[PDB]
Amino acid sequence: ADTIVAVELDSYPNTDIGDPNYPHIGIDIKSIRSKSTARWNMQTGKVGTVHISYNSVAKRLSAVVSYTGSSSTTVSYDVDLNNVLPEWVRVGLSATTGLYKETNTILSWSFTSKLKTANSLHFTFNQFSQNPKDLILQGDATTDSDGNLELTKVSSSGDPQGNSVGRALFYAPVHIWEKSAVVASFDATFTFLIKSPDRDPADGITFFIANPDTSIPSGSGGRLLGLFPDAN
Amino acid sequence: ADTIVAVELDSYPNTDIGDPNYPHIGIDIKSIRSKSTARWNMQTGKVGTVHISYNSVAKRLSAVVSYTGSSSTTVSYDVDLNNVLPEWVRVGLSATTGLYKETNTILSWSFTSKLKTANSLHFTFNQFSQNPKDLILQGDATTDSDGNLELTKVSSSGDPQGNSVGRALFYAPVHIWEKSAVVASFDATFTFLIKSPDRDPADGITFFIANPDTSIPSGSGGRLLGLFPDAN
Amino acid sequence: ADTIVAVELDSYPNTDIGDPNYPHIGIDIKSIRSKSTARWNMQTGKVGTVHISYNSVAKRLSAVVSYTGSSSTTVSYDVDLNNVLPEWVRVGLSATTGLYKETNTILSWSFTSKLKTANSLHFTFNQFSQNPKDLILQGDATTDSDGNLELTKVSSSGDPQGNSVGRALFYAPVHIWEKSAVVASFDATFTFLIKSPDRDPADGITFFIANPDTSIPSGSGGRLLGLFPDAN
Amino acid sequence: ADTIVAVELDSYPNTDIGDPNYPHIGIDIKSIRSKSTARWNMQTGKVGTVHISYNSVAKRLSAVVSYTGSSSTTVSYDVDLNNVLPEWVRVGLSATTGLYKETNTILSWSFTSKLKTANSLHFTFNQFSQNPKDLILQGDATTDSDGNLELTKVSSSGDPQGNSVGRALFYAPVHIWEKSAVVASFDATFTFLIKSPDRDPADGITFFIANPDTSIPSGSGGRLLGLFPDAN
Numbered sequence: 052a053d054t055i056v057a058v059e060l061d062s063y064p065n066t067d068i069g070d071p072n073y074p075h076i077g078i079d080i081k082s083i084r085s086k087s088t089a090r091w092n093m094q095t096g097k098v099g100t101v102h103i104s105y106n107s108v109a110k111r112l113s114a115v116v117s118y119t120g121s122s123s124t125t126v127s128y129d130v131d132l133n134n135v136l137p138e139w140v141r142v143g144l145s146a147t148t149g150l151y152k153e154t155n156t157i158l159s160w161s162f163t164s165k166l167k168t169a170n171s172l173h174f175t176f177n178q179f180s181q182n183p184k185d186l187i188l189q190g191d192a193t194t195d196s197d198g199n200l201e202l203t204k205v206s207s208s209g210d211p212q213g214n215s216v217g218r219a220l221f222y223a224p225v226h227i228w229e230k231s232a233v234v235a236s237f238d239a240t241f242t243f244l245i246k247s248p249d250r251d252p253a254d255g256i257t258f259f260i261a262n263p264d265t266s267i268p269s270g271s272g273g274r275l276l277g278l279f280p281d282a283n
Numbered sequence: 284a285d286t287i288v289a290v291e292l293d294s295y296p297n298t299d300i301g302d303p304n305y306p307h308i309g310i311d312i313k314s315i316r317s318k319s320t321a322r323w324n325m326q327t328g329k330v331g332t333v334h335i336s337y338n339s340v341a342k343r344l345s346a347v348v349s350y351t352g353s354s355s356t357t358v359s360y361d362v363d364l365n366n367v368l369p370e371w372v373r374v375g376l377s378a379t380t381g382l383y384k385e386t387n388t389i390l391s392w393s394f395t396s397k398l399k400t401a402n403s404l405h406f407t408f409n410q411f412s413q414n415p416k417d418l419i420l421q422g423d424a425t426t427d428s429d430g431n432l433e434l435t436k437v438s439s440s441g442d443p444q445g446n447s448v449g450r451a452l453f454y455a456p457v458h459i460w461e462k463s464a465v466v467a468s469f470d471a472t473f474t475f476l477i478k479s480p481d482r483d484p485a486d487g488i489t490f491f492i493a494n495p496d497t498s499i500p501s502g503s504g505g506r507l508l509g510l511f512p513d514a515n
Numbered sequence: 516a517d518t519i520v521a522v523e524l525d526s527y528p529n530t531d532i533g534d535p536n537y538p539h540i541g542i543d544i545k546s547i548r549s550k551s552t553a554r555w556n557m558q559t560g561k562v563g564t565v566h567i568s569y570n571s572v573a574k575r576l577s578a579v580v581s582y583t584g585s586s587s588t589t590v591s592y593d594v595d596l597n598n599v600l601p602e603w604v605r606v607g608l609s610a611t612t613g614l615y616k617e618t619n620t621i622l623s624w625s626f627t628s629k630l631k632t633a634n635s636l637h638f639t640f641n642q643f644s645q646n647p648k649d650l651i652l653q654g655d656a657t658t659d660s661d662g663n664l665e666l667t668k669v670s671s672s673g674d675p676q677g678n679s680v681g682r683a684l685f686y687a688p689v690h691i692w693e694k695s696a697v698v699a700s701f702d703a704t705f706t707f708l709i710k711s712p713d714r715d716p717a718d719g720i721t722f723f724i725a726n727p728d729t730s731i732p733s734g735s736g737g738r739l740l741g742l743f744p745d746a747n
Numbered sequence: 748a749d750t751i752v753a754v755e756l757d758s759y760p761n762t763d764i765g766d767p768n769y770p771h772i773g774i775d776i777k778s779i780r781s782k783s784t785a786r787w788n789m790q791t792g793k794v795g796t797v798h799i800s801y802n803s804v805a806k807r808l809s810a811v812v813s814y815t816g817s818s819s820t821t822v823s824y825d826v827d828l829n830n831v832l833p834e835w836v837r838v839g840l841s842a843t844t845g846l847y848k849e850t851n852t853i854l855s856w857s858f859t860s861k862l863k864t865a866n867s868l869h870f871t872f873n874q875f876s877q878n879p880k881d882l883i884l885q886g887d888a889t890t891d892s893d894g895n896l897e898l899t900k901v902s903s904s905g906d907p908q909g910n911s912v913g914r915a916l917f918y919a920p921v922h923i924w925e926k927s928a929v930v931a932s933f934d935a936t937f938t939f940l941i942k943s944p945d946r947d948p949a950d951g952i953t954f955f956i957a958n959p960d961t962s963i964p965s966g967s968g969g970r971l972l973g974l975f976p977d978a979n
């Protein structure tokens with residue numbers, strides 16, 4: 052299958068597949084069952100920001116999610132990503148809706164990769180354009196007239212549709228390690244707007260890192276965040 | 284055909300196609316016949332650096348080439364690149380050898396694009412890896428065991444071959460304008476090592492900007508720098 | 516006196532000192548009497564953005580001012596700033612009110628300087644803190660509880676006071692040229708919020724570059740933008 | 748006294764003050780007695796590179812030192828620097844010689860600080876100029892005709908002098924935390940050239956972070972790296 056590293060913002064607790072019993076952020080290493088989680092005071096209708104970082108000396112993947120005027124949620128996991136991921140990857144965003152639903156609106160996304168053997172890649176998208184040729188849009192992901200990326204289906208009136216799955220991948224492969232590297236790092240930031248008519252919105256949004264040829268696995272909708280074919 | 288904007292470092296004067304009678308740098312707008320040139324005191328066997336910039340408010344494309352301990356050469360051309368190039372492009376490097384020849388060794392290459400509607404793309408390659416998945420290598424272009432990019436053919440003993448043509452394009456398309464942009468800019472830097480057994484090395488090296496689907500035109504070897512199918 | 520290069524956003528036309536008869540942006544080289552102006556459709560109560568750039572090869576200082584949903588204003592002036600400014604400078608923002616007045620609220624400010632002999636300096640302030648130790652606040656300039664920089668006096672109810680003058684300078688000197696430079700460039704961005712009770716707000720806001728020891732000249736209030744001791 | 752966080756490159760083992768019995772790199776938190784060390788295969792006469800990073804979510808300060816063709820040395824220490832350092836700091840480099848000596852030549856230094864409440868500061872010095880107005884040079888630190896920073900005394904023939912102490916601080920204070928920060932990070936890189944006539948060169952080189960008003964403590968020469976007044 053694919054090889055996935057993800058930071059999930061998991062709005063829907065699926066205790067049946069190992070979620071804790073609250074919305075949470077999680078570090079996912081080759082499984083939906085997060086290796087580390089933290090409770091997330093999800094706020095619908097408010098714009099949130101997520102920052103993710105890692106460097107290969109610290110071997111600590113971390114993420115922080117916050118909204119204006121609120122406490123941040125943090126999560127960290129000790130991991131050498133070179134033992135998990137291939138040396139060339141694609142970076143992406145994923146989101147899913149299920150029976151319950153939510154918008155998974157990305158307003159901005161930026162990413163920096165460094166590889167000192169200092170090789171680097173940086174992109175920053177604040178306005179997504181109507182046909183973004185440096186993104187590979189998969190499933191239901193589209194950009195809208197407001198210049199936002201809609202990971203999952205929303206109606207023209209701005210209402211989220213159920214059972215949607217969408218991903219956006221930066222077009223260029225990212226070099227995250229190599230045999231002569233002294234140190235590799237990456238940082239990602241996105242802002243996101245989750246709105247929902249539902250008391251329990253579902254399912255979540257991720258930033259992820261995959262084999263470059265990654266595509267939405269069959270059976271990966273809802274709780275699997277468009278990342279994993281099963282909940283192992 | 285393709286649409287090309289290039290900064291050439293033209294080592295070989297081909298007065299028959301409008302070159303001035305000396306090595307020169309040039310700004311090429313949809314033609315090998317540079318819209319502006321400056322005389323270049325080409326130094327073989329020394330590492331040189333080229334910096335190219337443009338922003339859409341100034342509407343002035345410029346370049347500077349220097350070596351340590353030497354005078355720099357500068358060239359500028361007033362041009363609104365949105366009247367020349369499509370809004371999505373690829374950026375690349377090209378080089379050619381002819382009957383006379385030279386290495387067209389790139390040691391480092393970096394590029395930054397900005398589009399404020401602040402969207403950006405930045406890459407920097409200081410060590411080119413043995414299979415660079417974020418470059419599209421065309422013609423004879425390869426990376427070598429020293430972690431350099433060889434635009435044109437060199438033997439294992441490091442001797443340049445004649446009648447070579449090679450290009451390297453950054454894999455991701457670059458968004459250089461759009462209908463809602465307030466200002467777009469880009470900057471590129473490369474370092475290069477031209478060595479030659481010849482008293483008149485040929486042919487030259489370029490940084491270029493093209494339609495994303497660009498490929499080496501038929502008939503584009505030698506003086507045409509792997510950019511143009513003819514010398515119109 | 517000081518040596519000043521500025522981009523003015525001049526809201527108040529003072530035809531008596533050479534202003535054109537409308538709000539305008541201007542490039543000021545050692546004089547309030549702009550070397551180049553463009554008409555500015557000033558919009559009070561809307562957040563605007565200014566981008567300024569220059570590089571030493573192009574020798575073209577330019578600026579663009581825009582608001583969301585509106586046309587941008589651009590201005591350019593051909594100038595070699597090394598013939599104007601010393602090699603070490605400070606960068607700053609200035610603003611003034613007169614009998615008529617306006618807020619000169621800066622919400623964000625960023626600046627990048629490059630000097631390839633690639634030496635660089637970059638700062639970005641999105642939230643100004645209550646005591647910003649990397650700024651030299653002069654005259655009435657203060658930061659407020661919203662994390663904005665108030666160049667000129669505003670009451671706690673948010674009303675602009677008249678006859679105010681304030682400047683904010685980045686604490687560290689900036690190296691903009693030197694004897695061995697091949698190319699020097701800089702870019703600045705700020706966002707600003709000008710609100711006014713007045714049908715003709717006054718006086719304006721600038722980004723400026725000065726001798727490092729610059730201070731508000733005596734007699735520099737109002738139309739002189741806290742930059743110049745007179746209108747020569 | 749001062750408050751110091753440092754990454755030391757400690758060439759001289761002073762087992763009497765807690766050094767391990769080999770050259771080593773170390774993370775120093777308010778004491779010369781490193782909280783974490785790693786053995787360093789110091790190579791004199793070869794240019795080395797050090798990268799240091801930290802972010803406040805991971806709470807892990809790390810460093811890596813390498814030379815071309817050699818193994819890197821890494822060291823990490825878990826620490827929340829906001830519990831150690833004040834919110835405003837200066838960043839600097841220090842080096843000392845003793846009875847035994849070494850050059851402490853810095854060829855390049857760069858630093859990036861981020862504070863997302865995304866405020867940032869970045870500098871990069873590849874060529875140090877003859878009078879660097881954005882550095883505060885303390886003790887014997889000077890820049891030389893090659894455009895390098897000599898932290899400790901070297902003769903015009905390039906021979907290191909003994910019992911030297913010098914530091915270079917970036918002129919502007921750096922904001923590393925504040926009450927509303929969601930995440931703060933920093934990265935530093937320097938390259939360095941340690942040459943010595945001695946079989947056991949002394950004493951070492953550091954990157955450090957201090958209260959902004961930091962100055963070379965009395966009694967801080969040699970093993971104390973110009974950082975600490977004693978070896979507690």
Ligand SMILES: [Ca+2]
Binds near residue numbers: 064070254255274
């Ligand atoms: Ca879930």
Ligand SMILES: [Ca+2]
Binds near residue numbers: 486487
């Ligand atoms: Ca030619």
Ligand SMILES: [Ca+2]
Binds near residue numbers: 525528
């Ligand atoms: Ca005026």
Ligand SMILES: [Ca+2]
Binds near residue numbers: 757759760761951970
């Ligand atoms: Ca020691």
Ligand SMILES: [Mn+2]
Binds near residue numbers: 061070071075077083
């Ligand atoms: Mn989960």
Ligand SMILES: [Mn+2]
Binds near residue numbers: 302307309315317
């Ligand atoms: Mn030519």
Ligand SMILES: [Mn+2]
Binds near residue numbers: 523525534535547
């Ligand atoms: Mn004016």
Ligand SMILES: [Mn+2]
Binds near residue numbers: 757773779781
């Ligand atoms: Mn030690």
